[PDB]
């Protein structure tokens, strides 16, 4: 079978009566499906273990995930090869530790709480792909390195040094984090993975056969930033936030790369270098979005490709043909590269 | 008072009798010091909460940290402003959950275990500075951004593309991770912080008044790699592993930078760019280690500085004077940059 173990946070307060009530209705709809498990709660935190049929389990959990009485739902463990059940006795036993006064459950309550808020902290510092992998039923640390084709995405803020020059530290961080949120949301919805931030640069990747998603995610980012600029308060740093984006494609190594005590599940390869180099040429080329020939040809949609240049770098000494896409949004975003050359004054007066 | 909460792993097996025995001797030496708390164990994992006087607490914990009957000791929480005690009743009560059969502690045992291995996984993906900050009694997520002077360290592998060209993926990752371990150990012991890996590049920083530690950590790395090369098996990829290092100094922003769901506690500033640019010139300059004028002058030891060049980049259009240090190790390491231009053949035959 499949055994899922998750934790979540109360969206708003709940009383034992509502908790127990969710317990009962849980047990019933569970008995119907031969699903077994436990539900605990401790100071506004839910713990649950559910076991049963794969298709059954995922369907319950899809409903648990869209239920608005809890949030920050995180799968701690997914076992997909289960043959045994740990909670044969309960369709959905519920244990409210808040009310518990028992002598040994007490020291155990404060451990749980401390373990949990700690885990919550680490979650915030943890790459998204790690929890994906965990929810797909694998331990990230056990994945062997592998060669894979990827589209690599690289982006940064135009004239970011002017920002950090002129703005108080809290505004600078605020601006960068806004940027990073915009990119991460759109890249994730489009099926990609944001893998690293460095300075004000985003690095991400999509599966090798997803050039169209890479390009679209990028056009969407340009669009989102345009909404954000024209929507921002008067004098806002935000009104002159502009990005350059660079796309490349290549075979890369995917896996656990790092020192002994600290690793990233990430990629490593020539395409990472190429995408970064491409993004850096967006100033010279006056194109907010630049990508390689291979990204272009690997694309299968009717994009309005424009040949930009024949350019050198690296490497093997061969010139690489560089492309963008011509439409209202890239034109506006490309014009924004010029604007961004001279925002020091504007920024000065925030 | 101060309340410390940590978890650790059994270095080797222990029986309840040894566990309880550590409990008793714990309770006694604790009663002596007005220290209170709890010790739990669950399948080869120790949980402990200790409360008492700051100087008392740190002294016990210094002894706990160097005790070889457990490992992977991680402080989950440090409270330094405590006025109340949660475990007034026990100098060191011990609760072995392994033996427990109680009806509700049972579902609680499997939660603890799952929460814990999960937390263990995330630890591996988590920056070192986060646990430092936690052990110093602060929640990393609550630290406001701040301007600070830093020496930024940047390093990478010479001709790394030849490696990823010629070597199987497992060897490539093995080689990079070896590199990253060597740098991280030495940078950490010398008081610095490795903050990010990107491709095969390390980025780190030291406090602004620690140029001497920055330089020494770097010389030590060159030395460590030399030991590693000349110590490696015949034909090993390792025997042609070489690094270039770049040091810069400047005022930077330190803080939580990232999207909503994923952040790094890191730095951001011109000095980060400058150090990277400096490291890239190590090929041109034929100097394994290059650093800026400011790093030099901020240094207070009798280093054997050699002026390298007057170089341009960035930025503000001003030429920056670039330095290295002249001794047997930098000379050997600088000669290694030439060697590394032509290791494709050697690597081919591994
Ligand atoms: C902690 C918690 C546990 C839940 N467990 C279950 C569950 O085990 N089975 C189930 O069908 N539905 C559940 N639910 C919610 C149910 O999916 C929905 O109430 C109904 O099944 C939708 O018809 C749970 C909800 C919870 N809330 C408080 C966040
Ligand atoms: C789980 C565990 C808890 C410990 N707790 C304590 C403790 O609470 N107080 C203390 O003085 N010493 C301890 N110790 C170890 C002691 O520091 C040393 O045995 C002596 O104090 C050194 O004289 C603990 C050791 C442990 N091992 C099994 C990893």
Residue with token string 């373990």: A115
Q: For chain A, how many residues are written?
A: 350
Cα–Cα distance, B282 to B245 (Å, whole number)? 7
List Cα–Cα distances, B139 to B23, B52, B121, B173, B269, in angstroms.
30, 21, 20, 33, 24
Please report the DSSP string for B186-239 in residue order: HHHHTT-EEEEEETTEEEEEEETT-HHHHHHHHHHHHHHHHHHHHHSPTT-GGG
> Exposed/middle/buried for A345, CB within 10 Å: 0-12, 13-18, 19+?
exposed
- Residues A198, B196: C-beta atoms closer than 8 Å: yes
Q: Which residue of B has its CA nearest to A127?
A: B262
Give the CA angle between residues B45, B11, B118 to the nearest 5°: 40
Distance CA A286, CA A281 (A): 8
Q: Give Cα B176 distance to the centre of its chain.
A: 16
Q: What is the resolution of this structure in A?
A: 2.0
Q: Cβ(B35)–Cβ(B86) under 8 Å?
A: no
Q: Whose CA is nearest to atom 9 of ligand 1?
A: A26
Sign of torsion over alpha carbons A145, A147, A149, A153:
positive
Interface membership of A79 toward B (CB under 8 Å): no
3-state helix vs strand vs coil in chain B, percent to 5:
45, 30, 25
| Cα dihedral across residues A217, A221, A227, A232: positive or negative | positive
Cβ contacts of A12-21, under 8 Å, gap ≥ 24: A12/A69, A13/A44, A14/A41, A14/A69, A16/A96, A16/A98, A16/A99, A19/A94, A19/A96, A20/A94, A20/A96
Do A41 and A47 contact (CB within 8 A), yes or no?
yes
| CB neighbourhood size of A123 (10 A) | 19
Q: Which of A134, A141, A315 sits opposite B124 (nearest CB)?
A: A141
Alpha carbons A213 and A301: distance in angstroms, whole number: 10
Interface of B with A in 275-304 (CB under 8 A): none
Query: Which residues 184-223 of A have a C-beta within 8 angstroms of B?
Result: 184-185, 194, 196-200, 203
Return residues 243-262 of A near B (CB < 8 Å).
253, 255-262
PDB experimental method: X-ray
Instruction: Write out A124-164 in H/E/C secondary structure.
Output: HCCCHHHHHHHHCCCCHHHCCCEEEEEEEEEEEECCHHHHH
Residues at CB less than 6 angstroms from ligand 2:
B 22, 26, 29-30, 39, 46, 48, 50, 60, 63-64, 67, 69-70, 92
> Which three-class secondary structure state does DSSP give residue B170?
helix
Distance CA(B26)–CA(B92), nearest Å, equals: 6
Hey, how many other C-beta atoms are within 10 angstroms of the C-beta on A199?
23
Q: Does A273 touch chain B (CB under 8 A)?
A: yes
DSSP state of B15: -
Contact B238/B175 with Cβ under 8 angstroms? yes
Q: Give the burial string for A150-166 (b: 16+ CB within 10 Å, else e).
A: bbbbbbbbbbbbbbbeb
Question: Would you call B93 and A107 a contact, using CB atoms and an 8 Å cutoff?
Answer: yes
Say which ligand is closest to the CA of A48: 1
CA dist list (Å): A64 to A4, A71, A72, B61: 12, 10, 12, 42
DSSP-derived letter for residue A35 is -
Report whether B87 contacts B94 (CB < 8 A): no
Burial A100-119 (b: 16+ CB within 10 A, else e): beeebbebbbbbbbbbbebb
CA atoms of B155 and B158, how far apart (whole Å): 10
The total number of residues shown for chain B amounts to: 350
Ligand having the closest approach to the CA of A49: 1
Chain A residues whose CB is inside 8 A of the B147 CB are 169
User: Residue A199: left (phi > 0), alpha (psi -120 to 50), or beta?
Assistant: left
Q: How many CB pairs under 8 A join A and B?
A: 239
Please tell me the number of the ligand nearest to residue A69's CA.
1
Contacts of A259 in chain B (CB under 8 A): 177, 180-181, 183-185, 194, 197
**Cβ(A30)–Cβ(A89) below 8 Å:** no
Any chain A CB within 8 A of the CB of B178? no
Q: What are the residues facing B147 on neighbouring strands?
A: B253
Is the sign of the CA dihedral B241, B127, A156, B262 positive or negative? positive
Distance CA B207, CA B255 (A): 14
Count Cα atoms within 13 angstroms, Cβ side, for B180: 25
Strands A201-207, A289-292: pairing is unpaired
Domain ranges of chain B: 1-143, 144-350
């Amino acid at each position: 079978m499949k055994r899922l173990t998750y934790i979540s946070k109360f969206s708003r307060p709940l009383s034992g009566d509502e908790i127990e009530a969710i317990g009962r209705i849980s047990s019933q709809k569970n008995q119907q499906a031969n699903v077994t498990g436990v539900l605990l709660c401790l100071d506004g935190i839910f713990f649950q273990i559910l076991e049963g049929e794969a298709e059954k389990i995922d369907r319950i959990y899809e409903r648990i995930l869209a239920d608005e009485r809890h949030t920050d739902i995180l799968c701690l463990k997914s076992e997909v090869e289960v043959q045994e059940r740990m909670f044969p006795d309960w369709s959905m036993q519920t244990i409210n530790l808040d009310e518990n006064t028992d002598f040994l459950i007490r020291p155990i309550k404060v451990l749980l709480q401390t373990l949990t808020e700690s885990h919550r902290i680490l979650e915030k510092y943890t790459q998204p792909s790690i929890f994906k992998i965990i929810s797909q039923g694998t331990n990230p640390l056990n994945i062997r390195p592998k060669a894979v084709e990827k589209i690599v995405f690289f982006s940064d803020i135009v004239s970011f040094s002017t920002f950090a020059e002129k703005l108080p530290v809290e505004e600078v961080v605020s601006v960068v984090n806004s940027y990073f949120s915009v990119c991460t949301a759109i890249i994730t919805r489009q099926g990609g993975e944001v893998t690293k931030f460095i300075g004000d640069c985003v690095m991400a990747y999509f599966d090798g056969d997803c050039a169209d998603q890479a390009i679209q995610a990028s056009l969407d980012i340009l669009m989102e930033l345009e909404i954000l600029r024209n929507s921002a308060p008067e004098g806002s740093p935000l009104r002159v936030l502009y990005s350059g984006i660079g796309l490349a494609k290549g075979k890369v190594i995917e896996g656990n790369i790092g020192s002994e005590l600290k690793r990233d599940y990430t990629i490593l390869g020539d395409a990472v270098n190429v995408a970064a180099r491409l993004e850096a040429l967006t100033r010279q080329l006056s194109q907010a979005l630049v990508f390689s020939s291979e990204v272009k040809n690997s694309a299968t949609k009717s994009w309005n490709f424009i040949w930009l240049t024949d350019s050198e770098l690296k490497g093997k000494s061969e010139s690489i043909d560089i492309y963008s896409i011509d439409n209202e949004m890239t034109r506006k975003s490309s014009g924004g590269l010029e604007i961004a050359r001279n925002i020091g004054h504007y920024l000065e007066r925030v």
